[PDB]
A paper describes a structure:
Many streptococci adhere to protein-attached carbohydrates expressed on cell surfaces using Siglec-like binding regions (SLBRs). Siglec-like binding regions (SLBRs) are among the streptococcal adhesive modules that bind sialoglycans. SLBRs contain two adjacent modules: a Siglec domain, which shares some features with mammalian Siglecs, and a Unique domain13 with no close homologs outside of the family. The conserved sialic acid-recognition motif governs general specificity while sequence diversity in surrounding loop regions allows the SLBR to select between related sialoglycans.
We identified that a previously-uncharacterized SLBR from Streptococcus sanguinis strain SK150 (termed SLBRSK150) displays 62% identity to SLBRGspB but exhibits a distinct binding profile. In short, there was modest binding to each of the three trisaccharides, i.e., sTa, 3’sLn, and sLeC, but little detectable binding to any of the tetrasaccharides (i.e., 6S-sLeX, sialyl Lewis X (sLeX; Neu5Acα2-3Galβ1-4(Fucα1-3)GlcNAcβ; Fig. 1d), and sialyl LewisA (sLeA; Neu5Acα2-3Galβ1-3(Fucα1-4)GlcNAcβ; Fig. 1e)). The high sequence similarity and distinct binding properties of SLBRGspB and SLBRSK150 make these good comparators for understanding selectivity. To reveal how similar SLBRs could include or exclude different sialoglycans, we determined crystal structures of these five SLBRs at resolutions between 1.0 Å and 1.7 Å. We next turned to SLBRGspB and SLBRSK150, which both bind sTa preferentially.
Residue numbers in the entry: 257 to 362, 369 to 463
Write the structure that this text describes.
Amino acid sequence: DTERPVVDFPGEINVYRGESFEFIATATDNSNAFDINKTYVRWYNGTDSGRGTEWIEKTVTQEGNLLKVKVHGKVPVDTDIGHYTRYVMVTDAAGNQNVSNEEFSARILNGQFRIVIRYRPNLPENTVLVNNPSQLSETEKNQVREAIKQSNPNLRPIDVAGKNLDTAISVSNNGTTTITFRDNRKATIQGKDLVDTRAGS
Ligand SMILES: [Ca+2]
């Protein structure tokens, strides 16, 4: 057996701080036999799960001819916002890896994926009442920003663009709010969830 096994797994997965996740990689091989103990979710220069992503776990089973690699874990509430490149590596019974040790040392490889760590914002319990829901005043925008800050205590200055919560949380004129994180990724909160018209009944 000199044919490498082949992993099928998305090229990008999104996970959220404070939440658990689970994604299934499947692998096939001409021999239908695997060395199950030599399965790794790894980075390019080690078989460990990599610096900053030590919380990535794996569970490996085989169902008939199909190797099933469960990529799972719980993202820490205080891990860094950003993304990483990691790899699902499998080994057939004959010792052939899906990716060679030379390829890792040096183009997307089999089993390669980007894992993006995101923050999911909590909505405030109550909306802010505003005079004109399409022309918020600066005071009303500040009140919306403070409502978001209050409901999102684990969103810290280090997590956002410019290390400044007051400028990274940008409230538009109709209350729709964009948060820009330290990796320049975004979260958009609809204004209908944040503001209501004063005396609108
Ligand atoms: Ca093989």
